[PDB]
Amino acid sequence: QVTLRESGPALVKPTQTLTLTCTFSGFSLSTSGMSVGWIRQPPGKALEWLADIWWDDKKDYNPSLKSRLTISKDTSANQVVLKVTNMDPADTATYYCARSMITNWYFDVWGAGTTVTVSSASTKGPSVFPLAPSSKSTSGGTAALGCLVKDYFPEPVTVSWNSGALTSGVHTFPAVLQSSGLYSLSSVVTVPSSSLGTQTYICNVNHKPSNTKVDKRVEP
């Protein structure tokens, strides 16, 4: 129905302040009864409600982290801002904004969420290497190929194939944290064996935390 979109840094340093912005459409925070709230989810943990704000400018905060939270709204711009002070590595999480209503008191529509990492380390873009198809990656009328997206920080990174024209058969593996402190993943796709000498396969890797765009051709 309605749509919401979060935006903010991918990386903040310990003790700095995070500023998250929610932009919404389809409803108005001038509409009586309307509300926007913030929820977070650390890696591998449960959802945790952070804050909310209502059309009458009343605000509410989770005591488990209050003194560090400030929610505000700009109804002319359809935006809500959350500020979290004195950021700690334990605040590394994906942050969502969501809509609620005085007739509801639950969040019915959520944004996609945005990922925030607290670290003293600096952003680093990935290296993309081909995982080339060959006789050792074939299985019946099928051959697997891929891209290794290595040594980047922080999360996330996105991978498409042939500018999105190739979607079926793609497994993009969850990143692993390496002993170097940098992340690494692979994206693989199976294709008809017969198409290897004809169809060009290019992986499109995007690392927004570092303004990095890479296209790698994967040849047999």
């Binding site: 449960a46 969420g113 697997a144 891929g146 690494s184 693989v188």
Partner: protein, 362 residues
């Protein structure tokens, strides 16, 4: 502060099975914010009792009758299913039929009664602003009103003398309401995506949620039942409460879908020349579409079993065929890599009758 114990934390069931997720609520004892509203309710009861204490004698002496008007039958209504409607009817009764004509004698009594009525109005507004206490969603009140009607002038005096009892009934209603969760909601979350509203108001199906889901419960025990499990039901499920600040979630239930054993397809990829130029060699082993999740992948470099130089990554269960995929990446330095010839990935899995090895020579 309302906390939710969700069980089971993890669950693996077969297609067509019936699964029940339980969310047990646990409570903790908590001016113009909803966050401190049910904690500030005792203070409003205190304001009401003080003000009424300053007029109790005047009205108990002016009322020379002995038949109780607010009988416990009214409290039975208050704590019952239609209790919300009963309470608001009583509030309206006092604000409109008893208090306007009781407050006009002494300026002292008028001030006390007007404070009582203003607190009743403010309570009505706050219950309405917070957590859907109002508006609602009772023969005792009808009998109260009928007796009050029959009592003409003496009726106002009677109801005002029993205002302490009324306060106690309000207190009992609010205590019952805050020691319980009005509604339980449920969210379904697919890996790497925002939660989706699954069930709301304890038992109602949200958009695009099939008949296979149902919700139930009251007070402190709530449940989410999937009657006939489907491959797409793989997910993490969270109960959520909006009845009190802070809003809270359950611990979550991760639900995996059981299926028949499927053996993996094994592929191996040597390092690219582009990476070898940079001083590092990564060898990738791919196990595609297998069930169950457990698999043993070992690296052998010139027949030497390796340790400490590989990392695994495994996909989330497929929402269609219920399988997994796994990559194992062996990372060596280029020099180290060029000291050896044979690089092998060996896979043991339930779907394989003997371990499968994919290898290549450098």
């Amino acid at each position: 502060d309302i906390q939710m114990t969700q069980s089971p934390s993890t669950l693996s069931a077969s297609v067509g099975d019936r699964v029940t997720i339980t969310c047990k609520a646990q409570l903790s004892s908590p001016e113009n914010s909803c966050t401190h509203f049910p904690g500030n309710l005792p203070n409003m009861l205190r304001d009401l009792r003080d003000a009424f204490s300053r007029v109790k004698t005047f009205f108990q002496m002016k009322d020379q009758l002995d038949n109780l008007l607010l009988k416990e039958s009214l409290l039975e209504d208050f704590k019952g299913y239609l209790g919300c409607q009963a309470l608001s009817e009583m509030i309206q009764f006092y604000l409109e039929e008893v208090m306007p004509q009781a407050e006009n004698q002494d300026p002292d009594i008028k001030a006390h009664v007007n404070s009582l009525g203003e607190n009743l109005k403010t309570l009505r507004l706050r219950l309405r602003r917070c957590h859907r206490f109002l508006p609602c969603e009772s023969k005792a009140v009808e009998q109260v009103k009928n007796a009050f009607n029959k009592l003409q002038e003496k009726g106002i005096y009677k109801a005002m003398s029993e205002f302490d009892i009324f306060i106690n009934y309000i207190e009992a209603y609010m205590t019952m309401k805050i020691r319980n969760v009005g509604y339980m909601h449920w969210y379904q979350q697919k890996p790497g995506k925002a939660p989706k509203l699954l069930i709301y108001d304890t038992s109602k199906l949200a958009s695009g949620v099939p008949s296979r889901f149902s919700g139930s419960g009251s007070g402190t025990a709530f449940t989410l039942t999937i009657s006939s499990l489907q491959p797409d039901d793989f997910a993490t499920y969270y109960c959520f409460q909006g009845s009190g600040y802070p809003f809270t979630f359950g611990g979550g239930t991760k639900l995996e879908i059981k299926r028949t054993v499927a053996a993996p397809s094994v592929f191996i990829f040597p390092p690219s020349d582009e990476q070898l130029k940079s001083g590092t060699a990564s060898v990738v082993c791919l196990l595609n579409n297998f069930y169950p999740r457990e698999a043993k992948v070992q690296w052998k470099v010139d027949n030497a079993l390796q340790s400490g130089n590989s990392q695994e990554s495994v996909t989330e269960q497929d929402s269609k065929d219920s399988t997994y995929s796994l990559s194992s990446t062996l990372t060596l330095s280029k020099a180290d890599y060029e000291k050896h010839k044979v690089y092998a990935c060996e896979v043991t899995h339930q779907g394989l009758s003997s371990p499968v090895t994919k290898s290549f020579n450098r």
